[PDB]
Design an enzyme around this catalytic site. Structure first.
Site, short mmCIF file in Angstrom:
data_model
loop_
_atom_site.label_atom_id
_atom_site.label_comp_id
_atom_site.label_asym_id
_atom_site.label_seq_id
_atom_site.Cartn_x
_atom_site.Cartn_y
_atom_site.Cartn_z
N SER A 397 10.42 47.01 38.21
CA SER A 397 11.75 46.87 38.78
C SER A 397 12.73 46.23 37.79
O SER A 397 12.60 46.40 36.55
CB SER A 397 11.64 46.06 40.10
N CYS A 398 13.71 45.51 38.33
CA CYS A 398 14.74 44.95 37.51
C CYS A 398 14.27 43.56 36.97
O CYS A 398 13.17 43.08 37.25
CB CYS A 398 16.04 44.85 38.34
N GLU A 399 15.17 42.97 36.21
CA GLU A 399 15.12 41.68 35.64
C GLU A 399 14.67 40.61 36.66
O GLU A 399 13.81 39.81 36.39
CB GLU A 399 16.57 41.42 35.34
#
EC number: 2.3.2.27
Length: 601
Positions: A397-399
């Site tokens: 996923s993201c950061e």
């Protein structure tokens, strides 16, 4: 007489089993019973003749290498796990053939009136010519490179987990097509009565026109750059892990929409008209700013009656672990060897992702704290294994998902340290770790509760928002300072204020009793007082058994109920709790002695 020779040729442990099979066969010959099931008897051979009027023959799990000639009137053969490497000639009137879990690579000629061919889970590398009246073909989990021409009358074709690169032309009445986990570069024209199409994990780049009555389409893990028009009766649309840049109009009756890991920048308006029970997963799509805005607006409105929508901010390579690790370590030799340990790639990828996070950007100390932790990891193989395994996501996923998994790794590390003995002579550190774990646990429950209230949700952002925003006020040392997407978490200032209050109220009320059940505290007690704690455990076990019996004698017996599996579950559960509460009673003084001077504020 053939049967007597056979029964006597028995390995000694099979002698009784063979007598049992002869008894069954005699029963057939003597009463006209036309079903023979030879049982699970570790049989290594069967006799050479079977009774001749048998119409159903069932061969369960045995150690068979060969079957005899088959009874000429056979209609049904069913064979379970054995070591057959071939089958006898099949009787002309056979109707159903099942064989499972045999090293079999090829089948004999198939009788023209065969209707069911259930031959999944063998080692088949080819199929015979299929009889035209065959109705079901189930041949998944084999080693097939292709299928033969398909009979005109087939209604079901299952052939998942083979090595198929195309399918032959499909019969007009086919209702079910389930061909997932192959290497299909395409599907042929789809028959009109098909209601189910499962072809996940193939190599499809487009789909043929879809049948009007198609109810399920599962084609996740393909290389699809588009979907054709969806038929109005579709209930399941699972197309995650493809290359889709848009979706068609969504049929109003759709019950699942899984489109995560695509390249969608916009959403069909029909999505909002789906039922309130429909499941929707939009994660890992580059949804435009306005798309996401419009969504928040609609799902947030009062009277919104559409689906709950899961999303994230991820949008739409693996170095050697020692390269990934060298980037962080302050002046890596060790990390060469670690590179080959299980999940090392996952963790390598994780560390590369960590350098692109808000903590990395905004906290000049971040490189050094990751270095200290990497160094602790290098000295503890147990911890390191658990940590590497945890990296299996954060990379999904993201950061913020990466940052969240860092917090979870650091939590694992603190429990580990406590459990191992790092704090046996630093009991204020032990108690501090306990309080931190208590608070994090309470945040998990608070975040789960907040997630249930949200119609547009990123559950990881939610949980992260609570950890991140309450780090200072709750002394969450294992939590980092920075996060990127708090604005989309759905967590308000009032939410955070109430969670602070709840956790501090709970800890004051619950902590002293809660720490009695804390696992690392048990590890510490067992080290400091091994004989007393072992005695308490042994008593806990005995108390359960004795309390069970008393409850059985005093409550079940007079009823009821002593056979009754439900009443016995109810008292067993009660006897565990009773015994548990007594156990914690004997722990409490031991904890009070060891920890009392550490449990003040």
């Amino acid at each position: 007489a053939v049967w007597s020779a056979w029964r006597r040729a028995a390995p000694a442990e099979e002698s009784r089993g063979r007598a049992a099979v002869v008894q069954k066969m005699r029963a057939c010959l003597n009463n006209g019973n036309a079903v023979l099931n030879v049982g699970e008897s570790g049989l290594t051979t069967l006799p050479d003749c079977l009774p001749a009027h048998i119409t159903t023959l069932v061969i369960p799990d045995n150690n068979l290498t060969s079957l005899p000639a088959l009874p000429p009137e056979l209609r049904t053969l069913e064979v379970s796990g054995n070591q057959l490497t071939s089958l006898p000639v099949l009787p002309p009137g056979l109707l159903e053939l099942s064989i499972f879990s045999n090293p079999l690579t090829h089948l004999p000629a198939l009788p023209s009136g065969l209707c069911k061919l259930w031959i999944f889970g063998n080692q088949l590398t080819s199929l015979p010519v299929l009889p035209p009246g065959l109705q079901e073909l189930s041949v998944s989990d084999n080693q097939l490179a292709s299928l033969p021409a398909l009979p005109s009358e087939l209604c079901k074709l299952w052939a998942y987990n083979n090595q198929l690169t195309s399918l032959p032309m499909l019969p007009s009445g086919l209702q079910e097509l389930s061909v997932s986990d192959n290497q299909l570069a395409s599907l042929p024209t789809l028959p009109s009565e098909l209601y189910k199409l499962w072809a996940y994990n193939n190599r499809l780049t487009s789909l043929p026109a879809l049948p009007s009555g198609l109810k399920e389409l599962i084609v996740s893990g393909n290389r699809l750059t588009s979907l054709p028009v969806l038929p109005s009766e579709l209930k399941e649309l699972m197309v995650s892990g493809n290359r889709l840049t848009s979706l068609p109009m969504l049929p109003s009756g759709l019950l699942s929409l899984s489109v995560y890991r695509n390249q969608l920048t916009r959403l069909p308006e029909s999505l909002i008209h789906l039922s309130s029970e429909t499941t929707v997963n939009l994660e890992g799509n580059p949804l435009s700013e306005r798309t996401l805005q419009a969504l928040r607006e609609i799902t947030s409105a009062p009277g919104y009656s559409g689906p709950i929508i899961r999303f994230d901010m991820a949008g739409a390579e693996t170095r050697a672990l020692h390269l990934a690790a060298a980037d962080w370590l302050v002046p890596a030799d060790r990390w060469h060897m670690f590179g080959q340990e299980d999940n090392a790639d996952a963790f390598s990828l994780f560390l590369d992702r960590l350098s692109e996070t808000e903590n990395f950007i905004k906290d000049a100390g971040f490189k050094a704290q990751i270095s200290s932790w990497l160094a602790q990891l290098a000295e503890d193989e147990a911890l390191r294994a658990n940590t590497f395994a945890m990296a299996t996501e954060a990379t999904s996923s993201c950061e913020d998902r990466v940052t969240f998994f860092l917090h979870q790794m650091k939590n694992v590390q603190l429990v580990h340290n406590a459990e191992k003995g790092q704090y046996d002579n630093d009991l204020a550190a032990l108690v501090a770790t306990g309080r931190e774990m208590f608070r994090l646990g309470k945040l998990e429950q608070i975040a789960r509760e907040k997630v249930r209230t949200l119609a547009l949700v990123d559950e990881i952002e939610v949980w992260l928002a609570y950890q991140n925003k309450l780090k200072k006020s709750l002394g969450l040392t294992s939590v980092t300072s920075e996060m990127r997407f708090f604005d989309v978490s759905g967590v308000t200032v009032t939410d955070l204020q109430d969670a602070e209050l709840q956790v501090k109220a709970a800890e004051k009320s619950e902590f002293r009793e809660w720490i009695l059940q804390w696992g690392p505290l048990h590890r510490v007690l067992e080290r400091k007082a091994p004989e007393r704690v072992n005695a308490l455990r042994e008593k806990q076990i005995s108390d359960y058994e004795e309390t069970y019996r008393m409850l059985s004698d005093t409550e079940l017996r007079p009823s009821g109920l002593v056979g009754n599996t439900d009443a016995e579950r109810t008292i067993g559960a009660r006897a565990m709790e009773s015994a548990k509460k007594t156990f914690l009673d004997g722990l409490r003084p031991l904890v009070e002695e060891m920890l009392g001077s550490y449990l003040n504020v």
